Structure 1
Amino acid sequence: DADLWSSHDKMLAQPLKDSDVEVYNIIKKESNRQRVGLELIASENFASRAVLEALGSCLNNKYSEGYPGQRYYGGTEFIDELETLCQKRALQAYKLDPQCWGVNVQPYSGSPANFAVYTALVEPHGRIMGLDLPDGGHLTHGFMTDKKKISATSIFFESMPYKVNPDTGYINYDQLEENARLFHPKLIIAGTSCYSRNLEYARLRKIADENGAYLMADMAHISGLVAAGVVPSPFEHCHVVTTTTHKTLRGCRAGMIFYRKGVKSVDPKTGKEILYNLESLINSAVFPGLQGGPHNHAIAGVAVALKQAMTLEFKVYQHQVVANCRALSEALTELGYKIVTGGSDNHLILVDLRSKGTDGGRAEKVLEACSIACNKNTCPGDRSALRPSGLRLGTPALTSRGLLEKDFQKVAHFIHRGIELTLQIQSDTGVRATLKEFKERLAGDKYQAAVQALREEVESFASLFPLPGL
């Protein structure tokens, strides 16, 4: 009667460790995996303990559909304090005049943030232009083939990509300018997932105005760098700026949408001023358009991450991120590796493995087997996305653990050793071999000892550094 009811109360207060050992262990094994490994996936990072704590708060429970001062349900005085605080901070982090900029901090992640913007400004079947996927663009920027529209962006809107010059490695703004006059985009996306150089925002803005299109920046990858001023800000030339809250910003998974406010334009003779309406449209799209109840626990993590993003420690961190990237880039360049574009203005680089006689697909697996985390990626000039020539390496994750230039040089050496091992296996299985066979030889008995040797040396080196979280 009441024996089991007390057991119920004990169930909701019982620690994860006892309540679900199966899930507890998976988390433990994962924490260990992250500790002993070398994280070089550009999109990765480590959230601060303060941010992670906010996620487990009672904020999870409150349904707060709507916005501060425009809620559906009542009892949101504390939730309103939090959301208003989070957006106040978001504007500060980028030094934005509240009278000129506004922000929506409700997007569940980066992709939902982007889609929300298209839904509000582009509308069904409206045209969008983004960097081609194999050229370093993101799925949310549009992706389709002769056969089908793959990304939701291509499915609900009409997208056509602009490309990177296969020779230089830089975005071909000239071809974009030409095609925009033919396509008539309603919105141009200025953002990348795998690009080492700064974007010519002013030029993009010019091309946008010529076609009466919106210029939307997707700063997901460089959000942290832009915050610390380590890279030029997209806010000066863009109408809308979307972003992820994790990655280089070090918060929890979520997203934000920044939009222009105030005077859009004026009439020379009448003096009548037209104002921006981005705030209303974008807010309406997030809710009641696309999303439901806000994830207040995440909005807290974001708010916390934004306070940290404004500290000097963070600024130093971001400068170190770029310094480590330069160190890593030049170390590999000196070693005969071809870096697309020759270098980088940010946290990542794209290494063209054709310079060493191999590809990123094979190199990715070998490096993984040795606890070196990174991802394959097509290079400008690749005749097939099935056999990508490069590897995308980013420094934010390891930099957060304390790594410095000297450490990144050691990391560069470790990476090269992985490539040697890759080359060995590649030649050992023949020149007409498939990726399927390569994976088998890698997990085979012949290279078992070599992999373990390198893996252990990698793991013992990574183990020397702290792992933010706990």
Structure 2
Amino acid sequence: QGDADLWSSHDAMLAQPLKDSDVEVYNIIKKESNRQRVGLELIASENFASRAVLEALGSCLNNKYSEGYPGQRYYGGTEFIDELETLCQKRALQAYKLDPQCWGVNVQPYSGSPANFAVYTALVEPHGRIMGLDLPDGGHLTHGFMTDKKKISATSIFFESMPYKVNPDTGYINYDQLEENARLFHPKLIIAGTSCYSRNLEYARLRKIADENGAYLMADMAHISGLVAAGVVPSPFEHCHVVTTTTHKTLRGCRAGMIFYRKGVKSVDPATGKEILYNLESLINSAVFPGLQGGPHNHAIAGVAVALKQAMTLEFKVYQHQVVANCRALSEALTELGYKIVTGGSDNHLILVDLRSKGTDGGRAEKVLEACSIACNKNTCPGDRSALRPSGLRLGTPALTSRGLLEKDFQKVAHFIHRGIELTLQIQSDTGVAATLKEFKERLAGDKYQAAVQALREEVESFASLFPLPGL
């Protein structure tokens, strides 16, 4: 009751450090930090957020309910939150060199997938038709996915999605098939965005297609957010009606998302001779809130702001150029070493390596390379048969580049990857002429292989150890 002692014990609790309260978690965090430090990060969706950003996530901004938008709030005392949110929005539009009279932005999305879902809610409405790249061809779940057996992605549950595909030769999106199919399916909205594609998108062509079908062109630039900001790859802003993005990945911020949308005259009705105006702002705004979300995560919005500020520095622009340089280096190196690079190469931060040119699959390689502290993700290539046996490894440069790695370094990486593949091959051949993934993992745990793995792992960790790990 009174037990002031306890009440203090209580006041005390709330103020005692992480280290001291719940050590278990403190350790976990530190163990993970160590893991990040000693490993070679080639997962294209990963990056390391700056200290500034992390510092903002840890703020008291966590505490404040700010339902609604700046200047239309449903709670009081949002004067500082409003500075923040407005600042964030302003910085975002700056970072992408967008005219405030032609663009607005909502910065409340909790993450990427929330952002996309919000746009579909605002513009497509239930059962509305969406087309995105088929998942095995480098699409993302949120861009739609269903099998004959189940509607899998929420996009494909609450909307009718159909995929457009990448030509299993060229390795490029087959915009022509898209065109024909779009005329049959009548999409309400077409997504211009990938999770695994080495090439820029023909936005201008996509927009032709969309306008032809009276659909919206929504770009998901999550993967190339940062690349576009630094102008190292074409901007989708120039042709799309709406652009969604993640604030992490190449934008190197905390996990959150953003929706950019067109403001101004959509078209003039010669029938009325007057201008019909983009309504996207109210729809999207209403979709996010009070449609889908509740309380904004202000501590996340702060982190995004911090990220955006960094995005407009010259160091950032350089970083992005380097990111793409590194990717090219890595691609060239593997290609020289005889590996097949889907599409031939890369215009961006990732490549898709068709391990079939070495006679193995990403399914296996992923797991081995993992055991050697080389983090990548498997990923099907055009013309893959079973997605239980993906042919490909998706490799990207953002994470390592943020560590400092340059072209020569990326070449050394390509070599470490190669050793990884050799090991994979060894295991597979003892695995027997068509062993299961199961038997493969068992043999990998096998004593003979564990020795080879430990070898490579050590070299890999020491190499990674030599570069810093942003954010502390």
Q: Place the TM-score, normalised by the shorter chain, in its bin.
A: over 0.9
Partners in 2 of 1:8 and 1:267 — Cα distance?
66
Partners in 2 of 1:118 and 1:374 — Cα distance?
31
What does 1:52-451 align with in structure 2 at a 5 Å threshold? 52-268=54-270, 270-451=272-453
CA deviations on 1:134-165 (whole Å, 9 max, x unpaired) are 00000000000111100000000000000000
Offset at 1:432? 1.9
Offset at 1:375? 0.4
Higher mean C-alpha deviation, range 260-269 or range 293-302: 260-269
Offset at 1:245? 0.2
Partners in 2 of 1:56 and 1:264 — Cα distance?
41
Partners in 2 of 1:270 and 1:134 — Cα distance?
46
Offset at 1:181? 0.6
| Structure 2 segments unaligned to the other structure (5+ residues) | none
Partners in 1 of 2:272 and 2:111 — Cα distance?
43
Offset at 1:200? 0.2
Offset at 1:212? 0.3
Offset at 1:469? 1.1
Offset at 1:270? 3.8
Partners in 2 of 1:190 and 1:447 — Cα distance?
43
Offset at 1:282? 0.3
CA deviations on 1:91-114 (whole Å, 9 max, x unpaired) are 000000000000000000000000
CA RMSD of aligned residues (A): 0.6
CA deviations on 1:353-399 (whole Å, 9 max, x unpaired) are 00000000000000000000000000001111110000000000000
Partners in 2 of 1:36 and 1:443 — Cα distance?
21
Corresponding residue SS for 1:17: coil
CA deviations on 1:217-237 (whole Å, 9 max, x unpaired) are 000000000000000000000
Partners in 2 of 1:398 and 1:410 — Cα distance?
12
CA deviations on 1:295-317 (whole Å, 9 max, x unpaired) are 00000000010010001000000
Partners in 2 of 1:122 and 1:318 — Cα distance?
33
Corresponding residue SS for 1:52: helix
Partners in 2 of 1:34 and 1:383 — Cα distance?
34
Offset at 1:431? 1.2
Partners in 2 of 1:115 and 1:429 — Cα distance?
43
Corresponding residue SS for 1:215: strand
Partners in 1 of 2:465 and 2:87 — Cα distance?
38
Corresponding residue SS for 1:114: helix
- Structure-1 residue corresponding to 2:471: 469
Partners in 2 of 1:127 and 1:305 — Cα distance?
34
- Structure-2 residue corresponding to 1:50: 52
Offset at 1:267? 2.4
Corresponding residue SS for 2:209: helix
Partners in 2 of 1:60 and 1:423 — Cα distance?
49
Offset at 1:271? 2.4
TM-score (norm 2): 0.99
CA deviations on 1:308-332 (whole Å, 9 max, x unpaired) are 0001000000000000000000000
Corresponding residue SS for 2:14: helix
Partners in 2 of 1:449 and 1:316 — Cα distance?
40
Offset at 1:268? 3.1
Partners in 2 of 1:269 and 1:180 — Cα distance?
28
CA deviations on 1:22-60 (whole Å, 9 max, x unpaired) are 001101110000000000000000000000000111100
Partners in 2 of 1:444 and 1:433 — Cα distance?
15
Aligned length, in residue pairs:
470
Moved over 2 A (4+): 267-271
Corresponding residue SS for 2:19: helix
Partners in 1 of 2:38 and 2:265 — Cα distance?
53
Offset at 1:444? 1.1
| Structure 1 segments unaligned to the other structure (5+ residues) | none
Offset at 1:73? 0.8
Partners in 2 of 1:140 and 1:114 — Cα distance?
7
Partners in 1 of 2:386 and 2:420 — Cα distance?
24
Corresponding residue SS for 1:144: coil
Partners in 1 of 2:443 and 2:4 — Cα distance?
61
Higher mean C-alpha deviation, range 440-449 or range 334-343: 440-449
Offset at 1:333? 0.3
Offset at 1:269? 5.7
Partners in 1 of 2:449 and 2:302 — Cα distance?
48
Corresponding residue SS for 2:258: strand
Partners in 1 of 2:126 and 2:275 — Cα distance?
29
Offset at 1:446? 1.5
Partners in 1 of 2:223 and 2:147 — Cα distance?
25
- Structure-1 residue corresponding to 2:9: 7
Corresponding residue SS for 1:253: coil
Offset at 1:294? 0.2
Offset at 1:3? 1.2
Partners in 1 of 2:304 and 2:45 — Cα distance?
17
Corresponding residue SS for 2:429: helix
Higher mean C-alpha deviation, range 445-454 or range 243-252: 445-454
